[PDB]
Amino acid sequence: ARNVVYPLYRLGGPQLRVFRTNFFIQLVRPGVAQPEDTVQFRIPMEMTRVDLRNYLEGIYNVPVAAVRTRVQHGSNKRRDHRNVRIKKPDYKVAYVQLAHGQTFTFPDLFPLYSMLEEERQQRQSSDPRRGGVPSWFGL
Amino acid sequence: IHLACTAGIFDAYVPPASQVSIRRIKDYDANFKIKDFPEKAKDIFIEAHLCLNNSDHDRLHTLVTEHCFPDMTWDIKYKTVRWSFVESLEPSHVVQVRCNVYGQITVRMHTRQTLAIYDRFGRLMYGQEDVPKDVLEYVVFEKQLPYGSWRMHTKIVPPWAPPKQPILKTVMIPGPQLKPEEEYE
Amino acid sequence: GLEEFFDDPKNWGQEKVKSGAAWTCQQLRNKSNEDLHKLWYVLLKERNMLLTLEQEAKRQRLPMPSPERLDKVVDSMDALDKVVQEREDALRLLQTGQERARPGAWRRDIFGRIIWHKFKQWVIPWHLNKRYNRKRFFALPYVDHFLRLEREKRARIKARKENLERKKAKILLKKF
Amino acid sequence: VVVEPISDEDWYLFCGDTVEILEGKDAGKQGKVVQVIRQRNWVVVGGLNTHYRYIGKTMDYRGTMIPSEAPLLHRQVKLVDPMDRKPTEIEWRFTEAGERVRVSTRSGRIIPKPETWIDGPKDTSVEDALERTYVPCLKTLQEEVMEAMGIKETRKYKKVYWY
Amino acid sequence: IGIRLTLPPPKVVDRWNEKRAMFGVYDNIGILGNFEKHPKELIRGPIWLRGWKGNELQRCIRKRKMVGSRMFADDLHNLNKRIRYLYKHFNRHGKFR
Amino acid sequence: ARGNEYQPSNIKRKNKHGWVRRLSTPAGVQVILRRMLKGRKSLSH
Amino acid sequence: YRARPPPRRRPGPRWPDPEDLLTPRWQLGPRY
Amino acid sequence: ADRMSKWTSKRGPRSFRGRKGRGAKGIGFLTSGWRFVQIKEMVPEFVVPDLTGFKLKPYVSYLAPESEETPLTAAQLFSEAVAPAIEKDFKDNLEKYGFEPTQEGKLFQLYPRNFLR
RNA sequence: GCUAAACCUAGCCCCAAACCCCCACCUUACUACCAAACCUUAGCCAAACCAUUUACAUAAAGUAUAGGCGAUA
């Protein structure tokens, strides 16, 4: 879990257990193409390779082979009108190579105004014969 | 947005046995006679067109519908319009009666009228100032079937009527133009 | 496997999904404990799915299909914590009395402010630690002057707001 | 922007009330309130107080015109009696039917207050969201789940020095 | 440019308000009240000049010695500085001496 | 052309003007107290 | 506009309770 | 010079960059020669249920009856749990009903809090 | 004709009255986890320099009194 103080360990203690986990994981289509065994995750910055391996293996039952993590530095050059630097959050990206020769690719998700259309198609735009007169007067 | 109008026309009568529509319409108000429509139709038409000369902006808003105000006003904006009705020969009359759910009526008119529209510098561009010319017109009035005013919705042009008057101005119509490579072939 | 990170395929790109009702604190209080755990992990799966969906939608620049679902589950998640934490509270007292699970005390930092020091866990007793005793927990006398100033500053702020408040009301009563 | 202090108890108008105006444009006409905006006191009324506005206006292109409903202030507009046909002041008078209900001043009339779905593939049945499966337990969540699922542990937690 | 172009909204002064319709009531509580009171003790305001007048220096001395132990630190330092300056000025500066 | 008076270095930052150099002597706590009086956002590097 | 009730001396002896620290020293001895 | 900006792992000389981790927790210690020893007892090994046969789902039906918040105040829990028990047994010492005079024994202590989350 | 003009609440000043306010942080602060505090106020400024000297409710009274018996206190 995150934002919690952990029980400390002394030699011979019990196993530290998190019976109601706090972590929240999302996953993203890689920006530059990745091996067919790699899945790319965003995980909270208070999380570790061992945590993520156990996290996936325990919750989802997806056998993981290896994990490598990288902490991305959000940009801090984008100034508000007060001229205050505004920094979007740093994040942690985890590359997870699956085991047993499996393969994966992020599937392609995502595969009152009738009045304006109807009045525009029947707008009766300027008939250049008319030369600018109001047409409508049947007189 | 509670439009006061009815988008399009359900069945626009074709220019040259509807009591169910009467039952479904007059019920919602319960005080009306179709034979009371001719006088009101001519009165609203003439007073509204006089107001078009006046340029009383609010009165035109109250009389005409949303689909009818802006197109008239924009052209009439920044150019005087000296419209005038004169003595009529033929009484107008209902053409039919048509029924979220807002109703429609149509009226046939054969009038004697005059137009004179001047440029924003005062120069004539259309119509003759005082010639009383006969006209035939088909006009649809929409009825907002609470307190729905019986406004003039639109006028419809019949394809079997003579064309429009000439125009005192000379006009070009640039059609097939040249291209930097595509020739006039 | 990983397919649980995306909802059933029929909902892909639908632009609208029937969203149920977020759980309610009492409606969870009616439930047991094991079922509470299981429902928590169910909601975890849902929250992962929805956060992934949001990130992808933001990446495409196509609109988020139905964002409210995310908010709903988050609220449910929050509610769930409260319920179990309530039982936690409703046990601490009823077997130790303590109103806070994590032990702490009141102290005076080096600047004089009264601060609530929550304790950390250590495995040597405090009196022979070398980094703990470098951390002052007392106020030398030269601090006192600044305390007064700080209090005075705060007083001014309070006054202004209170004063300004009634002026608004007064002006309002001069309209009606 | 001056809006007089009127609290919820002192306020009477709501979304969907039969409202007749006292002043302003379209005087003395009745309508309904789609929305009441308490923060700035806007009263939208169907087709009443309308002001016609151009939509689609460029430097040349004129577009269409629509009667946008200009909202109204609460003093400008009062409620409508469904029987007496007269806007009467809403003096909060306690009644046996309801302690807080709109009661007319001219006559002892109480005005009522104006204010579906199916289970999906991922929604619970109602009768299964109320089962009283909870037995009152003094054991915390951790003990109960460990005993339930058979997780085993006997190594003891060693003493620690909090401070 | 130093002039406006729109007349301000005409202020409404209610010359027959409460606090204008009584300005001076009980301003003679002594000469016809058995001299129980004194108009001095009708005038609200600061504790250090309820019924007293002096120049700026005397006024600040009175403020010090009468409320100068309840006043915030920075204000008190400003006040002592003001006494020092007004002393220097009144006692060493001017045309007449 | 002149102006090379300042070659930055973080060790010297945090070991000449840090939070644990102000709190090492009482005058430094005067400085940090002045700065959290004036309401600054950089109490000490 | 019935004017406000006229000011008066507080009708009775002033016995300031001796608890509050604001009661001035001179208003507590035997002289007063 | 960037006084305002948050101080993080990416700024200082090489020593700083090595030392200041982030919120990620430690799991073990550093033995001689810059070697790392990780303990199985500091890895927060998760627990999960078997979701088989689970009748509860992420969203509740809108049709469910509306409710009211009544937080589990301590006396309420004690009543619901014990009051029948004390009532029945008093007609014929408190550890026999559920009380725990101390907490050093059991693995899931309440105060101080040992079990995580 | 451009550029420009023009406004009036945002708030603030002086008073009264009342005594006031989950997690991480002394190591390189915001980093889960190891062998000591007390000591006069100073001199600018006036004395036309400067050396003794030189301010920090009401009335008694600027009186007794001090003072290169002087500026002043």
Q: Got the DSSP string for D101-149? A: -EEBSSSS-EEP--------TTEE-GGGSS-------SS-HHHHHHHHH
**Residue in B104, B149, B105 with CA at minimum distance from that of residue B7:** B104
Smallest CA-to-CA distance from G3 within B84, E25, C60 is with E25
Q: Chain D partners of H63 at a C-beta cutoff of 8 Å? A: 117, 119, 126
Question: Cα–Cα distance between D19 and D79 in angstroms, integer?
Answer: 4
Q: Quick count: other Cβ atoms within 10 Å of Cβ A115? A: 17
Instruction: Tell me which residue of D117, D93, D118 sits closest to D103, measured CA to CA.
Output: D93
Query: What are the strands of the beta sheet with A91-98, ordered from one edge?
Result: A26-27, A38-43, A91-98, A64-72
Q: Does C41 sit within 8 Å of H49, measured CB to CB?
A: yes
Task: Give me the residue spans of the domains in chain A.
Answer: 1-139
Secondary structure element (H or E) that encloses residue D77, with its range: strand D77-79
Cis peptide bond prior to G13, omega within 30° of 0? no
Contact flag, residue E38 CB and nucleic strand I, below 7 A: no
Phi, then psi, of B59 in degrees rounded to 5: -65, -40
**What 8-state DSSP symbol labels residue C83?**
H
In sequence order, the β-bridge partners of residue A42 are A26, A93
Query: Distance between CA atoms of D21 and D33, rounded to whole angstroms?
Result: 12
Over the range B142-162, which residues count as b (16 or more CB within 10 Å of their CB) and which as e? bbbbeeeebbbbbbeeeeeee
Query: What pairing do the DSSP bridges indicate for beta strands A17-18 and H45-46?
Result: parallel
Q: Do G1 and E18 touch (CB under 8 A)?
A: yes
Give chain H residues 19-78 with Cβ within 7 A of strand I: 19-21, 23, 25-27, 29, 42
- DSSP run (H or E) holding B139: strand B133-143
From the centroid of its chain, how far is CA E65? 17
Number of domains in chain F: 1
Using the structure, give the distance in angstroms from the CA atom of C170 to the C1' atom of I5, rounded to a whole number: 34
Distance between CA atoms of residues B102 and B21, nearest Å = 11
Q: A15 and D153: CB-CB below 8 Å? A: yes
Name the minimum distance, in Å, from the CA of B65 to any CA of chain D: 10
Strand I proximal residues, A:8-47, Cβ < 7 Å: 8-9
Is B1-156 assigned to CATH 3.20.20.70?
A: no
For the CA atoms of B150, B151, B154, B157, what is the dihedral angle to 10 degrees? 70
φ, ψ of residue A41 in degrees (nearest 5) = -120, 155
Instruction: Render B39-87 in DSSP notation, one character per residue.
Output: HHHHHHHHHHHHHHHHT-HHHHHHHB-TTTHHHHHHHHTTS-B--EEEE
Task: Classify D26 in phi/psi space as left (phi over 0), alpha (psi -120 to 50) or beta.
Answer: left
Task: Considering all nucleic acid strands, name the nucleotide whose C1' atom is nearest to the C-alpha of residue F42.
Answer: I29
CA F33 to each of CA C108, C157, D5: distance values in angstroms, whole numbers, following the listed order: 15, 19, 43
Residues 6+ apart with CB under 8 A from H87: none
CB H116, CB A16: distance < 8 Å: yes
> Method of determination?
cryo-EM
Give the Å distances, CA to CA, from E6 to B41, E3, E9, E10. Answer: 48, 10, 9, 11
Please tell me which residue of chain A has the smallest CA distance to H47: A19
CB-strand contact C163/I, under 7 Å: yes
Is the CB of residue D14 less than 8 Å from the CB of residue D36? yes
Instruction: Determine the 3-state secondary structure of A15 from DSSP.
Output: coil
Nucleotide closest to F24 measured between CA and C1': I26
Residues in contact with A46: Cβ distance below 8 Å, sequence separation at least 6, in sequence order:
A2, A3, H22, H23, H24, H25
Specify the residue for token string 């509610």: C79
**How big is the CA angle at C75 (ends C69 and C77), to the nearest 5 degrees?**
100
Q: Provide the sign of the torsion angle of the four alpha carbons A98, A103, A105, A106, taken in this order.
A: negative
Residue A14: C-alpha distances to residues C123, H37, H44, H105, H113 (Å): 16, 18, 11, 13, 14
**How far, in Å, is the CA of A23 from the C1' of nucleotide I27?**
29
Rounded distance, CA F21 to CA F14, Å? Answer: 8
**Cα B16 from Cα C111, distance rounded (Å):** 98
Residue of D nearest to H106 (CA): D156
Rounded-to-integer distance, Cα B48 and Cα A122, Å: 24
Residues in chain G: 32
Tell me the residue range of the domain where F12 lies.
1-45
Count of Cβ atoms closer than 10 Å to residue C27 Cβ: 20
E67 touches strand I (CB under 7 A): yes
Q: DSSP class of residue E21?
A: S
| Sequence-distant (≥ 6) Cβ neighbours of residue A131 within 8 angstroms | B125, B167, B169, B171
| CB-based contacts of E66, cutoff 8 Å, min separation 6 | E47, E48
Q: Considering CB atoms only, which of E21, E26, E41 is closest to G6?
A: E26
CA D24 to chain centre: 27
Is D160 at the interface with chain C, CB within 8 A? yes
